[PDB]
Structures are given as structure tokens and as C-alpha cells.
């Protein structure tokens, strides 16, 4: 039994938001507004990333609705609200039995003046596998039409060919394209020169050569240290003219100091979560970041009293999600050794428990680090982090070392995600694959070296629409066709649950 | 429960501040701190980290498994905060182990680690005031048993209640840390009572005493990063003593505040091990290392060894699940209500025990208003207890400020509020509010000088003989001092010793 969640007591101020500028003057004017803003701007990750990291993405539309309008009116200073993409699309269907499209429509109505930001995985939009180009373009068209205003487009290997088409589609739909560099490694560690400052500079130059409106720096594992953050942001600001959007996780406890370091260097936007859903593997707290910068040269653009009022509601509704809580959470600097993103951390822990190795999770994480080194020190983020996690699980579960796969390897049946990674299905890693180990991994199957979307089976939306209309009881909308293409079986199971249980999204949590 | 993981250390064998103290004395330690370019770290894992997170319930049995690893694997530590605070009372009352026994065992296990204790000035580890000779005897015995650093503070930042303790610590050849409790916001012009000049003058006065180190205690984590930089700078250009900053991470800004203070030139900062850090506890030691890694000043610590130690601490924290606070998020409302973490938890518990937990929000608002009504006082033990009790009283019987100011001449205010307004805790900065004080005491004697002057005299010979009667043997000096500080608690501990024996030897 729970009391009603506390409702915020706001002090409303009418301002013109970035969403209003986008609606009236387009993406370039929004870019100018961000460029002309002296304060650092904030993107609230509460609706997507905060509960993806802390609550296994299980946060429901019903709890979102009770506070969405309060966020829209009480925090008009926000650059945007990250409310879509990531694991939310799949999790909604699969586990919450609510449509991500329905969530987007309801929030869009409730939040007219808030810019809606989505995490978009480049060639595999919200999936884990590459889709043909027209599928990606159609997804982007529907997402922009239904109210996504900002597309943070990233590729799990920082491979620009996998991002170009999505960036172009976002621009063609009159929305804001965020081209993302995934940060990994340590630019201040000379012993690790692969992802050095020059690598990021060149990548940022290439991304700016695209039409991307904003350059995002995505630190999926909270690897960006404060001095590293200041240096990287400074070098990027000297290399390109796009506004910078930094996104970090607080898993090592250094999120606030990293954000302040980037703010000194001139970052434009930083990703924050509400205090009650912040810290740990989630983003740094928005209230905390306000007080960190309060009397410095640059302030955080936010109504902190209103944010503290909103946080009471978020604190109350988090209690509904006790079964999905991770547990005791402390700052964890081991993330600097094993570069596992939080989602990869929890999923790997769960899989090790199901496998029956939870007592050896320490050497599981060591295997993760060594597997990453064996694959060639790859950027570990969805879905590339799944590859490393699966390989490490496989190598501990059958007691393999590096030499075991390098000499005995030709006999083992490596997990399919490792195989798919080494066939080039995820794209091309920086510096290419390790040729010998690639030969061991893919014994005989075909290996591609170009954009996997080129080799994607063609999809025609008319036949898919007719077939879906047969499979479900009615004529599907464009969003439903796009969902069926991305997650075929998941969408059908969701339709089955809709026919059998109805809109359970209306139930209170 | 699995056996806690033991650290795999890489030992370096360097000379520590404890060695300098043992061979060359406190002044040489101060010079060593002054000459150190890096920021030095004080580990609060053994006292403050588990006082904040585990209700001070961490037992000697768990400390023993890792004490030597801390001593050898982290020789760079300036000191380990392992005594004082609520630990002294809690050990006896709830853990049924002697704080003196803990100190002796840890001292043996940690020969090269400087032991730091939180000392409450006029009170040693109690909540009331004690006569001067009792405080001096406590300091003598604590220094003899192995306490090397005494962080001496007074709950109202009143120097007369710290002078005697500082002098006794110096006379015993140990390091005296004179402490300013931080409160308010030195960068908020609308709250001028505790401005930068107040702290500067207090620091000058403290340096006039023989204090070796000036400590800035931010019991509630109120010190914001820009404020931290500015305050440490102004203090650094005011006095010559090294600065020792201690903050809590309640608002989520502990690390950034420490980095700001490191920029301003703070010499020592208080950190907890990662597994017992964050939230209402201190910022993480590993986190503070990686925060400063490539800046002008590094943190002096073997971070690999610290990360190894943290595995053990993480494992043993699981034994203390019944004492956990719960889901912990950064909380910037501490800037409004300046509750210290311990005051926060105890106030929550008391409100629940009287059926008011559903309105803890207005309870905290009452706490803030009560603080403003008492005159914006420094809220730390035991002064924070006074504000907490008054706020509980006013919500529980539905009073406002007008109620106590007009109708208040007939209610029975709680005794700790009465004791505070009688001057038993000392004299607040700016004095008491005249009308409220009269309404509060209503008949009783109000003193304006050091309460220890009017403390009933204590003679250790008669106390020792009486204690030897009450227990079955002749007590040591530490046992006499404990009996004077906590008479009933010590006797109940002796009863439990006679009945159950040394339960401290059991695993948690
Ligand atoms: Mg700007
Ligand atoms: Mn993220
Ligand atoms: Mn403290």
C-alpha cells in the first residue's frame, strides 16, 4: 500500500523553449539559440536513461503521466527531455505491454513545450541488428511525425557510414540531428593510444562534415574523467563549430565533477536525471549540478526549486518499482578497468547467476576486460557491449583463456553474437578486426567489410502492411508497420496480450 | 554468507605521518603536511562512514579482518578516523564491546597509521558538559591508548569550550585539530550571520591557541564547491595552519567540493572507502583519486590497493543489512534543512515512533523554521538534537512560531531545548533570542559563561573505589573515565559482560 505521490507546488514562469524555436524557426535557429546561451543547458534523462539504468527500463507511462505536465511547465529551461529510444522501445512492448508509440503520443500531448529527444542506434534504429536503409528512413519519418524532435544518432563502433543515412533522414524531416561520438578508453593515458584525443578530433571533423546539428559525446560507461572531460571538450570546441552535448553516467561517482570540468571547457548541453533517479549507474543529479555550478562563471539553466518539487513525485513513484531495484549502490571505480556500461553490468550479472557463476563475477569482469583487449580494444556500447559480455561469459563458462581460443579455438562453437560481430554485421571496428582470431571465430561463414545495410534483404512496406493486417485484426498504422519490422515476434506477442488483457498501461503501477 | 574477499596488495613501505609523530612530534607532522604538495587523505571508514550509513553499528570483528591491510596497503593516509563521535556510546550500548578494547586492538593491528578521534570539546564523547579535569583525564588516557589526532570541535563554534581540550592534547604530545563547524552559505548575501569574515575571525582565534591543524567540519554537507574554494582560500590567506576539510556527500556534491578545496590549497580531506561512501557518508577515496588524477594536485593514495580493500568492505557491509537506511539518492534539500545525516535518521525514527512519518516533509520544514527561530544556530551534535527535539515538539502538538511566542508561556518545552536555553551547551554566536529564552526556561537559572565552570567536581579516587564496588574488580583508568562519561551505559555493559561475555569475538 502506498500514499498518493506528492504533487509538485511549482512557481511557473512563461519562457520560450527550444521546442518553440524548433516549431517556429527550425533546427538551425535552435542551434543558434544553444550557441548563444551562456549558461549550460540541461537534458533530463529521467524518462529514458535514468530508469533504464536504475529500474531495468521498467518505468511505466502511467507514472510518467502524473508528472509530465509538471515537468513541461515547471522546467521550461530544459533543452530537451530524453524520453524515447534505447531499451525503452523493446522493453515497453515485451515487459510492460504498452506501446512505445502510445507513450510518445501521450507524453507529446502532455508536454507541448518540451523538446523530445530519442536515442537512435544509427543503422539498427532501436533494434540490435542492422535494417535496410528505407526501414531506417521510415522509422525516422514516423518518429519525427509523432513528436521526436532530437535524434541522438550513434553507432556502436563510432563508424560514420552507419550514421550518415540516419543523420540525413533526420535533417530531411526538419528535426535536430545529434551525431554521437562514443567515448571509450582514456585520452590522458599514453599507454592506451588507440582512442586518443586526435582520434576524437578527426571523428568530430567527419561528423561535422555531415549535416549534424549537434555533436554529442556519449560516455556510456562513465569513463570520462574530469581532466579528460575538460581537455576533450576544449579540443572538440577548437575543432568544430557545432554545440557539444555531453552525456555521462555517474557509476564511478565522478559525474558531477566531470560535468563541471566540461562546463569550464564550454560544453553546451549536459545530460542529467532527477535526484531520486540519479547517481550510481544513472546520470548525475540535475539539482546537484545546479548547486555545483551555482556561483561559478557559468550557471545551469534550470528552475531548481521546481526541479526539487518534481523530485518528490519521482521519489514517491520509485517505491512502486522495488522488485526492479539493483540494490545497494556505491561509487564504483572498477568501471575504469572493466568498461562495462551499466546495462551490460546488470545483464551480465543476471546471466552469470542463471548460468551459475555469480560467485566468480569478479573474474567474469576480468574476463570481460581481457575479452575486450582480445577483440582489439573495441568501443563497448549497445549492441557491441553485448558481444564482449557474451564472449566473456562463454570463456569463463567453459574455462577458456586467450590461448585456448587462439590454439584450441577452431573447435569451439562461439556464441552467435560474437560470430555476427566478426562477420561484420555490426560494422567495422576502429583498426579492423584481429585477423587471426577473426579466422578462428568465423570458421567458414561469409565476412563482409562494408556497411551491413547494403546487404540487407529488401523490405516493401505495402506487402508488410498487408501481411500484418492479416496477422492482427485490423489495418495497422505506419508506426505499427515500422514496429512489426523492427520487432516482429515481440510486436505480435504484444498484440496477443492486447487482445487478451487490453490496455494494461492504464493500470496504476 | 561467503567469506569476505581479502585484498591483494602491492606494498610500498614508506614512512608515514605516524612515524614522524612518534619520532619528531606534532610540529614535524605539521611541517610534513605543509611540505606535501599532494592533498592528503583521512579515511573515515572506521568511524564516520558507518556512523552515517550503518547507524554506527560496524563491529571490531569486521574492522580486524582488514585493519592490517589498510595499514600496509595505504601508508599514504594522513590518518584513520576510527574513534569518537557516536562510536563510543554505540559500542557499549548496542554492540556490547568496549571502545577502549576496539582502540587497543586496532592500535596493535595498525602500528603505522595515525589514529584520529572526533572530540566534542567541553563534552568528550558525551552529550552533556563535564568538568575540566574529567576532559583532561579522558584526553590523557585516549592519547596513551593510541589516539594521535584529536579533532576538537564545539557545537556552537565557541572557542572557550575548546581551549582546554586543545591545551590538554598539546600537553600530551599529540596533534590538536581545532575545528570550525561550517553552516549557512558564505556566498548567500541574504544570510550574513555566518559570512566569510566570521570564519576568518574564528580561524584567527583558533590559531591563537596552540592548535596544530585547522579543521573545517561540514557536518551536513552544506559546503558548495565555489563556497569551498572561496572559504579555503580566505582561510589560507588568514592563518598558517594546514587545513583539514571534512564534508558529507548528502547533496551529491562532495567530490566537486573537495576538488574545489584542492584547487584552493586544502591540505587534508576526509574520504570513505567506496563501499561505505556517498549519500550521507563521505565522498569516496577511490573517486577522489580519479577526480584529481591529472590535475595540478593529486590525491596521495595507492588507489589500486584502496580498490582491493574496498572489496572486503563491500563484502562485510552485507552483514549489516538490518541497519541500512534504504534507497539513497543525492538530496539537495539538505541545503534548505541543514540536518546532519545522523540527525536526519534519528528524527525520522522518532517521528515514526510517534506516528508522524507521513508528514516528515513539514517536519523538516519545521526543523528549518525552528533553526531560524532559535537564531540560525550551528546544528551539529549535540546542538542539532535541540533543533530536532523542538521541531518534533512543535509538529506533535501543532504549534507555530506565534503559538510559542504568545501562548508559549505555559507549555512544557522539551528538556534539551531547556538545557540549550539555560546555557548548558554554551553560548551561541549572537546570543539567544531574549523573549524566546525567557519563555523557554520560565523559572530556571541561566548561565552566560562556560558550563564547565559550574560542573560538579569529580575526584577519580572515590569514583574508582565506587566503581570497584559496583563491578567485580579494580578498574583501569579508561574504565573509570568511561564510568564518568556514561555511568549507566557502562554498568549495563558490565552486566552484559558478566552474563554473555566478550560477544565482540563473534562474527557479525
Ligand atoms: Mg552555449
Ligand atoms: Mn547513457
Ligand atoms: Mn562528519
Numbering used by the authors:
A (entry chain D): 486 to 994
B (entry chain A): 487 to 994
Give the original sentences from the paper that presented this experimental model.
Pyruvate carboxylase (PC) is a tetrameric enzyme that contains two active sites per subunit that catalyze two consecutive reactions. A mobile domain with an attached prosthetic biotin links both reactions, an initial biotin carboxylation and the subsequent carboxyl transfer to pyruvate substrate to produce oxaloacetate. PC is mostly found as tetramers of four identical subunits, with monomers of ~120–130 kDa in size. This enzyme possesses a tetrahedral geometry with the tetramer organized in two layers. In this work, we study the structure of Lactococcus lactis PC (LlPC) during catalysis in the presence of positive allosteric regulator acetyl-CoA.
The separation of reaction steps at catalytic sites does not reveal the large conformational changes in the PC tetramer that could be coupled to the function of the enzyme. To explore the conformational space of the tetramers we performed a multibody refinement using masks enclosing dimers of BC-BC or CT-CT catalytic domains at different layers (as the bodies shown in Fig. 1c). There are only a couple of patterns related to the CT domains: showing a positive correlation of the same catalytic state when they are in the same layer; and a negative one when they are in subunits from different layers bound by their CT-CT regions. We have also observed that the PC subunits bound by their CT domains show a negative correlation in their catalytic state.
